Each structure stands twice: as structure tokens, then as C-alpha cells.
Design a binder for this molecule. Structure first.
Ligand SMILES: C=C(C)[C@H]1CN[C@H](C(=O)O)[C@H]1CC(=O)O
Ligand SMILES: C=C(C)[C@H]1CN[C@H](C(=O)O)[C@H]1CC(=O)O
Ligand SMILES: [Cl-]
Ligand SMILES: [Cs+]
Ligand SMILES: [Cs+]
Ligand SMILES: [Cs+]
Ligand SMILES: [Cs+]
Ligand SMILES: [Cs+]
Ligand SMILES: [Cs+]
Ligand SMILES: [Cs+]
Ligand SMILES: [Cs+]
Ligand SMILES: [Cs+]
Ligand SMILES: [Cs+]
Ligand SMILES: [Cs+]
Ligand SMILES: [Cs+]
Ligand SMILES: [Cs+]
Lengths: 254, 254
């Protein structure tokens, strides 16, 4: 059987390969998520067809409760699997199925080395350093929904001034941190990838929560549980950690 | 109708409450897993009867391949849920359904403070300091099945003299660490709890793998997905973190 896999460009999970000529089909892509998909397909014995989500989004709900992104692709049975850094969340888990996590992480803070900022409360209690998150992502949703005082304060700040503190995507966020006085609230695995490559940046504080990425399937799909068992096998064999080290490790920080 | 919940005594997850009279029913018990069970039952709206697993085991396979412990209670439909620090593993996930994790953790090392030992490699390359794990637990299985060179060596040591380096339970392991030249390979969440209470002990190195604890249900359970959603809600609200802080915090160490 050939499975249709929805995905999205996101370093280092899914990237365009480098080549002298135009590329076609699955050969267009490489990354952690392509390696994962390869291992899963060998364990479970399926073939696969990788398609970028047409609207370029992960999956959030609008005011009318309608979904977009890779989540909507699954709800509508336009894909068999979503393989991406798709955060397992309460709201998504109500409308699609996820495997157990293939990576665990938490929200943390990307900012410059060598400053007095130590934690999110240090950001919450001031207004000179701007801070925000990718608009409509699981990090933003976390803050919008929080009832913890510090995070309520932070949400009030991020959402002020027509959400001027938010960014459209992680790359925009990375550039804003590098150039201006701005902190990005970012999933810790992406932070690790960034700070391997930008020696002037650092994670600030630890993880403010705990969550995972999981393979998405339509609700009621039989592949959800097979993929879970396959992920646990890869985890216990040390394969997922080897895959992470392959794609994360940078060129060293002087 | 009332759900039967299998569990096991294990500090600080499930413990006998302290009282001046004999205790009965759910009132016998307190701890992280009792708080979790309460929260789950309020979200999902069920009543429950907590029942200690009769053989006092978590769940492992005998040579015939028949299961025991909480895992077997679920297989046999003698319990509806298992709420305990029941590690989510490849072998278990084949025979029962686990919620998504309510806690994430890894194997690490419990040892004495003040020594030059820094990692599992340091242990593996020597014979003066003994080391082991709880017999037939998920940590022992990790070493038993590892194809990583260092962990193969460590397993060879752990299995000599008919497994004399292994212990029957965590308290025996802790007492051996306190009294003799011995390090215990232990789940990091249990190391955190021990080292807040025994000031001469410390965790050595970081986590050598990654995994979670989940709520166990029989394969096919109408509650598995409902419980996963409730866990996600409790995580996102900061309630699991608060519960961990309540039960882990000690006031005596350094
Ligand atoms: C790359 C981004 C936009 C994705 C990745 N996982 C989160 C998601 O699945 O919503 C988003 C990041 C975030 O919200 O910090
Ligand atoms: C307390 C012990 C016997 C349990 C706890 N979780 C692991 C399990 O579920 O197998 C075991 C610990 C270990 O093997 O380090
Ligand atoms: Cl699951
Ligand atoms: Cs090219
Ligand atoms: Cs294949
Ligand atoms: Cs679901
Ligand atoms: Cs700092
Ligand atoms: Cs509050
Ligand atoms: Cs700069
Ligand atoms: Cs209840
Ligand atoms: Cs009861
Ligand atoms: Cs299962
Ligand atoms: Cs050393
Ligand atoms: Cs040390
Ligand atoms: Cs080997
Ligand atoms: Cs302490």
C-alpha cells in the first residue's frame, strides 16, 4: 500500500535537498522527518507519497471552529499520515489521532547570550525587551489559554498593539531576536537547533511545559497504533536519538 | 458503575496515608497517582475503587510468555485502569493501551556525592564500583536488550554471579547505594525524589534514554482516548507540574 503523507517545510525536519538539477517526488526532501518516515516504512512495510500541505499551515481553529493545515488534511481524509513537528495538544487530539511522541520538548525562550534575563517571569515583569511567539501556533495557544498569572501577563503583552510582538514563522522570529531587542517563545527542540548555529543566541530558563510531537492520522485510523509501536521500537533501540544528533549537531561554538 | 483501578505502592506515587485508626477503601492511599486519579475522575465523571495489584508486580513476561502484575490485571479485565509509574514500553504497548504520558523521564544513575564518576561510561569501564538495577523492571530490560556497546558491557556485569548486582526493589537498591560501593540505574523521576531526601546521594550524568509513564487500559477500552485528552488538559493547565512539585519537594538537602 502507498500512504499519502502530508508535511510542511521546517528545518531540520523537512527541507529541500541540494542538487544540480530539478528534483521530483520524494527525492525533493530530506530531514529528520524523512529519516523517520523511512524507518517507519521499513518496520511496518508501506510505501509513501510525501505532499506539502497546500496552505502551508500546521493546524489551528478559526472563530467558527473550522480547522486548516495538516490537521484539516487529516480530518478530510486527504492524507493517511502527517509527519512533521506537529505538537500533540488537547485541541488537536479532539479532532485527529496522534501516535505516541517521537520527540519530547517544551516551550522555552530564545534570546541573546550575556543578558540579565533568566526566566519568563523576568520578561513578564518588564516592557522594554519585546517578546512573542509564532502567530496561531501551539506556543501562542498555550499563552492565550493559560490562567497562570505570569503567562496571563505575557499574553496581555503579546496580544497588545494588534499582536505586533508576534511573528508569522520561526525564521522571522529568529531574525527579530538577532537584530533587535526581542525574545522568542519557541519549542525547545527548535531552540537547540538554532543555538547550535547561532553562537550569540541561547535558551533562557528551562522548559515551561512538557509535550511531544507525534505522527497524526485521521480519527479511527489503524496505522495510529502500529506507528506507536514502531516509534517505541526506534526509541528503545537508540535510533531516534541517533537521528536527532545527525540533524541537530552544528559546526561548534567558538 | 465504578471503575476498578489497579495500582501498586511506590513513593511518592501511591503510599499508605498516616492515621491513628485502621483505614479502608480509597482512604488508605495518598500520593501523586491518587491526585491524578481524582483529577481524571472529575474531568471524565467516573467513580473508582483503588485495588493494589495482588502479586505486587508492574508487568513482565514469564517464559511461557504469560503476563503478570498490573499489565495482566488489565489483559484479564480485572481492572479498568492502571494508575502507577508504569513505564510505556514496546513490549507492554503490544498487550495493553497506554494513555499519552503524564510524566516523561529517563534512566539515569543514583550514586554517592563527591566522587569522580561522571557517566555510565565511567561505570562500564571499571569493576571496583558495583552497579545494577531493579530485577525484571523496564530499566533491566533496557540493558538486557541494548545493542549499544557500553550498555552491553554493563549488562554483562549486571548478570554475573546469577544477577547478584540486581535488587528486588528500589528501597533495597537505595540502601545498597547508601551502605556499600554501589550505583543504582534508576528512573530519573525516582532519583529526583530520593536525592531530595537523602543528602549524601546524587544523580550521575543525565538521562540515557527517554520514555514516559502512562495510564494503562485494556486493549479496546472506551476510556483510553478520553484519558489521553484529560491528561493533555491537565498538562496544558499546569496541573501536572503543580502535582509533581507537591509530591517531590523535600526541605532537607543539600
Ligand atoms: C514551526 C511551528 C510554526 C510549529 C511547530 N510545532 C508547533 C505546532 O505544531 O503548533 C508550532 C511552533 C510553535 O507554536 O512554537
Ligand atoms: C518501581 C519499579 C519496579 C518500576 C517503575 N517503572 C518501571 C517499570 O514500570 O518497569 C520500574 C522501575 C525500573 O525498572 O527502573
Ligand atoms: Cl496513544
Ligand atoms: Cs538547483
Ligand atoms: Cs518500505
Ligand atoms: Cs483522538
Ligand atoms: Cs541569563
Ligand atoms: Cs491567575
Ligand atoms: Cs546582531
Ligand atoms: Cs468523580
Ligand atoms: Cs469509592
Ligand atoms: Cs495497543
Ligand atoms: Cs571521570
Ligand atoms: Cs561526579
Ligand atoms: Cs554493538
Ligand atoms: Cs535541594
Amino acid at each position: 500500500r502507498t500512504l499519502i503523507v502530508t508535511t510542511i517545510l521546517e528545518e531540520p525536519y523537512v527541507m529541500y535537498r541540494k542538487s544540480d538539477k530539478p528534483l521530483y517526488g520524494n527525492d525533493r526532501f530530506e530531514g529528520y522527518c524523512l529519516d523517520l518516515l523511512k524507518e517507519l516504512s521499513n518496520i511496518l512495510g508501506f510505501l509513501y507519497d510525501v505532499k506539502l500541505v497546500p496552505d502551508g499551515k500546521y493546524g489551528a481553529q478559526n472563530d467558527k471552529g473550522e480547522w486548516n493545515g495538516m490537521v484539516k488534511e487529516l480530518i478530510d481524509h486527504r492524507a493517511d499520515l502527517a509527519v512533521a513537528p506537529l505538537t500533540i495538544t488537547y485541541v488537536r487530539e479532539k479532532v485527529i489521532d496522534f501516535s505516541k511522541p517521537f520527540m519530547t520538548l517544551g516551550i522555552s525562550i530564545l534570546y541573546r547570550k550575556g543578558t540579565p534575563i533568566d526566566s519568563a517571569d523576568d520578561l513578564a515583569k518588564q516592557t522594554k525587551i519585546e517578546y512573542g511567539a509564532v502567530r496561531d501556533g501551539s506556543t501562542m495557544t498555550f499563552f492565550k489559554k493559560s490562567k497562570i498569572s505570569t503567562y496571563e501577563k505575557m499574553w496581555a503583552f503579546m496580544s497588545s498593539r494588534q499582536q505586533s510582538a508576534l511573528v508569522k514563522n520561526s525564521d522571522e522570529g529568529i531574525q527579530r531576536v538577532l537584530t533587535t531587542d526581542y525574545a522568542l517563545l519557541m519549542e525547545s527542540t527548535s531552540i537547540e537547533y538554532v543555538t547550535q548555529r547561532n553562537c550569540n543566541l541561547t535558551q533562557i530558563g528551562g522548559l515551561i511545559d512538557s509535550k511531544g510531537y507525534g505522527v497524526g492520522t485521521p480519527i479511527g485510523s489503524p496505522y495510529r497504533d502500529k506507528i506507536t509501536i514502531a516509534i517505541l521500537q526506534l526509541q528503545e533501540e537508540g535510533k531516534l536519538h541517533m537521528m536527532k544528533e545527525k540533524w541537530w549537531r552544528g559546526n561548534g561554538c567558538p
